[PDB]
């Protein structure tokens, strides 16, 4: 088997699982977004348990 090159470029792996993802919607216009959204989307998160069944099988 091989690791998906396209997928691996966007998710990091932390200790004891907890695959770290990125946040989208940083492309075009700040004025379409609020201050809290702009300051919170910079933080990155982890896929959910329901998403985990679609992430573990991915790699």
């Amino acid at each position: 088997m091989k690791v998906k090159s396209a997928a691996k470029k966007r998710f990091k792996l932390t200790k004891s699982g907890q695959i770290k993802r990125k946040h989208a919607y940083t492309s075009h216009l700040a004025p379409h977004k609020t201050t809290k959204q702009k300051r919170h989307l910079r933080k990155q998160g982890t896929v959910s348990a329901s998403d985990f069944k679609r992430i573990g099988n991915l790699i």
Binding site: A6, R10, K12, K22, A24, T26
Partner: protein
């Protein structure tokens, strides 16, 4: 995903400044873990005999861990953490940084 856009092409991608560059590995000596090790007067010659590092290989050595120990030894490492350095200097052990 049945017609839905694949997840990778819905989120941005990471950027790696270490592109085309391979980071130099570092064998780290955590005080809590090496406390189990009985070796004294530590040097690269003794470490390869205990198979903590491959004999047919040499890698830079880093010191890590603020877990205090209770024996003075001789340390020959290449890198060291400040809290780890304090922990090993207060334990009366001697540390000489190698380069």
């Amino acid at each position: 995903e049945g017609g839905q856009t694949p997840l990778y092409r819905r989120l941005p991608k990471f950027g790696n400044a270490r592109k085309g560059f391979l980071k130099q590995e570092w064998v780290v000596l955590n005080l809590n873990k090496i406390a189990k090790l009985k070796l004294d007067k530590i040097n690269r010659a003794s470490l390869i005999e205990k198979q903590v590092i491959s004999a047919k290989s040499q890698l830079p050595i880093k010191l890590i861990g603020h877990t205090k120990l209770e024996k003075p030894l001789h340390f020959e490492v290449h890198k060291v953490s400040k809290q780890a350095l304090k922990a090993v200097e207060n334990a009366n052990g001697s540390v000489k940084l190698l380069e």
